[PDB]
Amino acid sequence: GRNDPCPCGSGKKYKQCHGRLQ
Ligand SMILES: [Zn+2]
């Protein structure tokens, strides 16, 4: 859903930015 809140404000990005948790 292009939910890249954080300081990205976009889509997909966050998953690669704040989506990974390892
Ligand atoms: Zn981010």
Swiss-Prot record:
Binding of Zn(2+), residues: 6, 8, 17-18
Domain of life: Bacteria
Localization in the cell: Cell inner membrane; Cytoplasm
Basic residues composition bias: residue spans: 12-22
Gene null: resulting phenotype: Essential. Leads to loss of translocation of lipoproteins Lpp and BRP.
Homology family: Belongs to the SecA family.
Functional description taken from the UniProt entry: Required for protein export, interacts with the SecYEG preprotein conducting channel. SecA has a central role in coupling the hydrolysis of ATP to the transfer of proteins into and across the cell membrane, serving both as a receptor for the preprotein-SecB complex and as an ATP-driven molecular motor driving the stepwise translocation of polypeptide chains across the membrane.
SUBUNIT field: Monomer and homodimer; probably dimeric in the cytoplasm. It is not yet clear whether the form that functions in protein insertion is monomeric or dimeric. Part of the essential protein translocation apparatus which comprises SecA, SecYEG and auxiliary proteins SecDF-YajC and YidC. Makes direct contact with SecY.
Protein name: Protein translocase subunit SecA
Organism expressing this protein natively: Escherichia coli (strain K12)
Gene: secA
